[PDB]
Amino acid sequence: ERPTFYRQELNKTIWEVPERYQNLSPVGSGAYGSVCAAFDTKTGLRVAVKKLSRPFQSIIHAKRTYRELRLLKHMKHENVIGLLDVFTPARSLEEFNDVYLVTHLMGADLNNIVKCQKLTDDHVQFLIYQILRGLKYIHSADIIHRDLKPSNLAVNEDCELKILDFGLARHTDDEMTGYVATRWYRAPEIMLNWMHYNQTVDIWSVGCIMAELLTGRTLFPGTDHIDQLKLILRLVGTPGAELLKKISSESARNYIQSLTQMPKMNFANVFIGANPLAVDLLEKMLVLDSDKRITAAQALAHAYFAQYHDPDDEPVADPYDQSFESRDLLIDEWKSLTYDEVISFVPPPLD
Numbered sequence: 001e002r003p004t005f006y007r008q009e010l011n012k013t014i015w016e017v018p019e020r021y022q023n024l025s026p027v028g029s030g031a032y033g034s035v036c037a038a039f040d041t042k043t044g045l046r047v048a049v050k051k052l053s054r055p056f057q058s059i060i061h062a063k064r065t066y067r068e069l070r071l072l073k074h075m076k077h078e079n080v081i082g083l084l085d086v087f088t089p090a091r092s093l094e095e096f097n098d099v100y101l102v103t104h105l106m107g108a109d110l111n112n113i114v115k116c117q118k119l120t121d122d123h124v125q126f127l128i129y130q131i132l133r134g135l136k137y138i139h140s141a142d143i144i145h146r147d148l149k150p151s152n153l154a155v156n157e158d159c160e161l162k163i164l165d166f167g168l169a170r171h172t173d174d175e176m177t178g179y180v181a182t183r184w185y186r187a188p189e190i191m192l193n194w195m196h197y198n199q200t201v202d203i204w205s206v207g208c209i210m211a212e213l214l215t216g217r218t219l220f221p222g223t224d225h226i227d228q229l230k231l232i233l234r235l236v237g238t239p240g241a242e243l244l245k246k247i248s249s250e251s252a253r254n255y256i257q258s259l260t261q262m263p264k265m266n267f268a269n270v271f272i273g274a275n276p277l278a279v280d281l282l283e284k285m286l287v288l289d290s291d292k293r294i295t296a297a298q299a300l301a302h303a304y305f306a307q308y309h310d311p312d313d314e315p316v317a318d319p320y321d322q323s324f325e326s327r328d329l330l331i332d333e334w335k336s337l338t339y340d341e342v343i344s345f346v347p348p349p350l351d
């Protein structure tokens, strides 16, 4: 009933995997887990196999593992990463210490593509169309990516795009400091802790990515947070009273009122020679007030995507029960939760 498992030490971590996974080759590790490329002999797919580093070490660890499983079990979209397989070598709940996730192997991101390929406006259209299509799906289930960047967008040779999160790491304070790609794509409200954030933080990141595809250059390469806010605000303008009032942090509100007031720039003179439709969409994405930002759903109807848009083939997600996000549980409760879900996984119909 249970497939047979086999052992292999790679980089002094033990991998126990069903025999159907062959030719395991390490691709990356990080505090939260290690990844291998593999060949699934049962489907003829090349796969990535993520083994979670100490999945139930803390409460906050055990919850995180439960969170990633649920997410990845829910996501079934062309432009979003799907789960091909999840497994444990544990034979019971008492043995359960280890969690392995299987997806389609990605190889080449948008950061590979913007660095090493001349992109036409049609290429930018197709790329941004697919992110927006994926985000419409992610957002309709109330899931927020929070970390959209070119290194989290997976792109094949026909320019076809999947949203994932490659992040194997902790997301600390220093990793966000300095001249770092980990902070260039973030919405200003979440970068600076301005207010309680929402879905539209993802849209900010899309406008950041999109700019970069049009110019082949980072839109906001801040040497630090404050220097990144000065960049942002130079492009889009210092806020007025209406937005100032919405920033819950009085301390941070006091800082943006220190700044010499600036008008929103002429985007057609920042983005010299762009499709005026690309320009227009950028101005409706890169809006400081997240209440005023265009949504994915509204963006898929923008004239800039007329060649791709089909309102009959841009689906929403199924209802996602996220009520667990507001419960306190013990490790063994998260672990058992995770376990039901492992033991319950039913494969994609081999498409």
Ligand SMILES: O=C(Nc1ccc(Cl)c(COc2cccnc2)c1)C1=CC(F)C[C@@H](N2CCOCC2)C1
Residues within 6 Å of the ligand: 027, 035, 048, 049, 050, 067, 068, 071, 072, 075, 080, 081, 101, 102, 103, 104, 105, 106, 107, 138, 143, 144, 145, 146, 163, 164, 165, 166
């Ligand atoms: O992609 C995820 N996890 C994941 C889960 C399993 C694996 Cl194997 C991977 C890595 O895939 C690779 C690795 C190396 C080379 N090619 C492909 C990643 C995500 C985890 C999340 F918790 C969230 C998530 N994301 C949420 C927002 O919408 C998009 C999906 C994606």
